[PDB]
Amino acid sequence: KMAFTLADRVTEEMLADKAALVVEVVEENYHDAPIVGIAVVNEHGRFFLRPETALADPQFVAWLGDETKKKSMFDSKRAAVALKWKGIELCGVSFDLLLAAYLLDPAQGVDDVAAAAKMKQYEAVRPDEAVYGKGAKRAVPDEPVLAEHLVRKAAAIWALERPFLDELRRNEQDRLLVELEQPLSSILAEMEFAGVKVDTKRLEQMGEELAEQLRTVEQRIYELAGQEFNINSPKQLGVILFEKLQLPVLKKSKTGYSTSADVLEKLAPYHEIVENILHYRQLGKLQSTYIEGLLKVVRPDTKKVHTIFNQALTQTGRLSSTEPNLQNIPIRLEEGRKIRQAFVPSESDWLIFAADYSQIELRVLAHIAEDDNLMEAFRRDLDIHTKTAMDIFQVSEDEVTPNMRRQAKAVNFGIVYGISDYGLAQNLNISRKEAAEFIERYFESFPGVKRYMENIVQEAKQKGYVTTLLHRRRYLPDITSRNFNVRSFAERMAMNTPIQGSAADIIKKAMIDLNARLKEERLQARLLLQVHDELILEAPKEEMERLCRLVPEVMEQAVTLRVPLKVDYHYGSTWYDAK
DNA sequence: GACCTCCCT
DNA sequence: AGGGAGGTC
Ligand SMILES: OC[C@H]1O[C@@](CO)(O[C@H]2O[C@H](CO)[C@@H](O)[C@H](O)[C@H]2O)[C@@H](O)[C@@H]1O
């Protein structure tokens, strides 16, 4: 039962210039959420402070905001954002244990202090789920249980900083933490806090239209089936399709019949019900996920959505986005793409600006494999899919048909994602031997990429892990498995991770550089979103001409590869128009 | 509460 | 390759 002072007021010894700090936000979504307690551990002892007290105290608030007072935390973004909503600035965070753990091994799934501490045989702190409970039983406990927990977390952070930093340094990941991921965390905090404005009237009118179209298609489905049923029930739908209407059963699921879109597409020539079910699903997905889903998370006071970017989740170093997810808003089909009309600038006479890398993953691959043919292709800024068709089919530019380009494109994705005989076959709807011939001809045209693929697999086996341009790592223990499927998946991860991961490194660095350029130029332009290889901003209309030159340049110069990077850009009144 | 089709890069 | 988010048990 760890010693600490349950403090009634803030004292000078709580404001040392080095400390572990816990600002606890228990709600999963930390936007405008309560801070339930504070703990500080420093050279003078261990302290718990009630937030009503600490956050009203001018000395404490100035300490929080002083860059020269260094704090070590876990998930400093959560605290920073929660504090921003209360008008308080958090500065001087020099060590974030969540990001440190994530870099050391993303596969551990570290999401609390206890899981991080377990990596170094430190168990004198409880998992958050043990203290707060799970699901419906989730609750803040009484003060003495709460206080002890926060203090134990702080004490763990204080104890673990040094060994985590030592291991990062041995991995050559110390600059990755200190110069990339930690400064990025501040930039993401500002993006989440600013949020993105939504035209909720426009979404509601879309929702009304969709509701009418759904009622129509739905009636049509019941007419064509000859009865009413729950179209979203796999049991009822599978009975209608595969028993009542006798459609061929092309694929089963562990429980019943598959009605995935790929199966339905193949069944459409047999019965008119099938196109209507597909249409119903496109509409229903829009309605349910995007319209209703966005509307439920829009803040009614500002009409903004404030995503949370999970910076310590993906196995490759990408971000993810949640509540809402703003990295999967429809774009591919026009009907869906119109959802983007509802994402608007947050001030009048401002516009949305979007800049995206062109083929970043293939250009990274060109660089890392040093394939002469691929590098020349990007040096000429060729259409990479047409060029790959020309090579694999041994034809001139004029003889590449649309279908040939389409298939070369699939091969390029396949090569990036780890090249499987069977996997390319499923994808192109072709045979296994056929897919192998495409891959062999690819590797004959790009022998540098073949060498890379062989070499990276051997390197993952030898070292136990693969690395990215900026020294992110991924351990791949399944690469020595004697099970074919398990081993092959590890091999694909070995081939793909340095590509997807290095692309993630580059865009993160560009975000950092951009943020610094925007400040130097004193532009009001603000970063709103990152969607893997693109950045989305809003700015005054009067800044567009300048952003057209600045943004692509910063993004293109973020790193120097053996091939150029290229960035395209667009702007307009809504996110839809920025493209 | 847990398990298990479709949107994005 | 990497993610986030209703029916049935
Ligand atoms: O604060 C984001 C940060 O917290 C973790 C838990 O350590 O994830 C929590 O917050 C996410 C966003 O609200 C939730 O989606 C997630 O379920 C919740 O545990 C980290 O994974 C994340 O980096």
Which contacts of A538-541 are long-range, i.e. CB under 8 A and separated by 24 or more positions? A538/A196, A538/A345, A538/A346, A538/A347, A538/A350, A538/A351, A538/A352, A538/A353, A539/A350, A539/A351, A539/A353, A540/A347, A540/A349, A540/A350, A540/A351, A541/A349, A541/A350, A541/A351
Report angle CA A190, A196, A201 to the nearest 5 degrees: 160
First CA to last CA distance, chain A: 59
Tell me the C-alpha distance between A166 and A104, whole Å: 11
**How many of the other CB atoms lie within 10 Å of CB of A27?**
15
Query: What is the per-residue burial (b if ≥16 Cβ within 10 Å, else e) of A199-229?
Result: beebbeebbeebeebbeebbebbeebbeeee
Tell me the C-alpha distance between A403 and A278, whole Å: 24
Tell me the C-alpha distance between A478 and A457, whole Å: 12
Indicate the SS3 state at residue A178.
Answer: helix
Architecture category of domain A309-359+504-578 in CATH: 2-Layer Sandwich (3.30)
Nearest to A375 by CA among A135, A542, A562: A562
Tokens of A300: 């009614």
CA→C1' distance for A109 and B3 (Å): 20
A300 CB inside 7 Å of strand B: no
Domain A360-503 has CATH 1.10.150.20: yes
| Partners of residue A344 on adjacent β-strands | A197
Tell me the C-alpha distance between A361 and A532, whole Å: 11
Cβ-Cβ contacts under 8 Å for A210 (sequence gap 6 or more): A283, A286, A287, A291
**How many of the other CB atoms lie within 10 Å of CB of A388?**
28
Tokens of A460: 């993952």
Nearest to A558 by CA among A382, A412, A363, A416: A363
Tell me the C-alpha distance between A339 and A361, whole Å: 27
Question: What length does chain A have?
Answer: 579
Question: Do A46 and A3 contact (CB within 8 A), yes or no?
Answer: yes
| Resolution, Å (one decimal) | 2.0
Element (H, E) at A207: helix A200-225
A493 CB inside 7 Å of strand C: yes
Cβ-Cβ contacts under 8 Å for A565 (sequence gap 6 or more): A357, A360, A363, A506, A555, A556, A557, A558, A559
Architecture category of domain A194-308 in CATH: Up-down Bundle (1.20)
Tell me which method was used to determine the 3D structure.
X-ray
Tokens of A405: 């380009």
Q: Where in the sequence of chain A do the CATH 1.20.1060.10 domains occur?
A: 194-308
- Whether residue A324 is preceded by a cis peptide bond, meaning omega within 30 degrees of 0, is yes
**How many of the other CB atoms lie within 10 Å of CB of A396?**
8
Look-up of token digits 């729950």: A230
Element (H, E) at A570: strand A567-572
Which residues precede gaps in chain A, with C-N > 2.5 A?
A: none
Report the residue among A32, A308, A311, A315 best suited for mutation to probe ligand 1: largest number of ligand atoms under 8 A from its CB: A308
Nearest to A241 by CA among A214, A211, A273: A273
Question: Do A57 and A109 contact (CB within 8 A), yes or no?
Answer: no
Query: What is the per-residue burial (b if ≥16 Cβ within 10 Å, else e) of A243-258?
Result: eebebeeeeeeeeebb
Tell me the C-alpha distance between A105 and A316, whole Å: 11
Spell out where A390-469 has E strands. Answer: 465-467
Nearest to A306 by CA among A29, A513, A8: A29
Q: What is the dihedral of CA A67, A54, A307, A102, to 10 degrees?
A: 60
Alpha-carbon dihedral sign for residues A310, A316, A317, A318? negative
**Strands across the sheet with A526-530, in order?**
A526-530, A534-540, A350-357, A567-572
CA→C1' distance for A496 and C2 (Å): 10
Look-up of token digits 């780890």: A418
Q: Where in the sequence of chain A do the CATH 3.30.70.370 domains occur?
A: 309-359+504-578
Alpha-carbon dihedral sign for residues A361, A363, A365, A368? negative
Burial class, A290, CB count within 10 angstroms (exposed 0-12 / middle 13-18 / buried 19+): buried
Nearest to A54 by CA among A79, A28, A29, A18: A79
Q: Name the closest nucleotide to A237, judged by C1' and CA.
A: C7
Residue A472's φ and ψ, nearest 5 degrees, are: -60, 150
CA→C1' distance for A115 and B4 (Å): 27
Q: Where in the sequence of chain A do the CATH 1.10.150.20 domains occur?
A: 360-503
A547 CA to centre of own chain: 25
**Ligand 1 neighbour A312 (Cβ under 6 A):** yes
Please list the helix, strand and coil fractions of chain A in percent, rounded to the nearest 5, in that order. 55, 15, 30
A216 CB inside 7 Å of strand C: no
Nearest to A479 by CA among A499, A456, A500: A456
* Nearest CA, atom 18, ligand 1: A28
Cβ-Cβ contacts under 8 Å for A415 (sequence gap 6 or more): A365, A439, A442, A446, A449
Residue A540's φ and ψ, nearest 5 degrees, are: -55, 145
Residue A202's φ and ψ, nearest 5 degrees, are: -60, -45
Type of residue found at A80: A
Q: Where in the sequence of chain A do the CATH 3.30.420.10 domains occur?
A: 1-193
Nearest to A513 by CA among A529, A503, A527: A527
Distances (CA, A) of A418 to A38, A338, A341, A405, A422: 47, 33, 36, 20, 12
Distances (CA, A) of A332 to A278, A323, A329, A339, A410: 16, 22, 10, 11, 16
Q: Which nucleotides of C are covered by protein (CB under 7 A)?
A: 1-9
Question: Do A76 and A185 contact (CB within 8 A), yes or no?
Answer: yes
User: Taking the C1' atom of B9, which residue's CA lies nearest?
Assistant: A532
Architecture category of domain A1-193 in CATH: 2-Layer Sandwich (3.30)
Tokens of A310: 């999970």
Type of residue found at A510: A
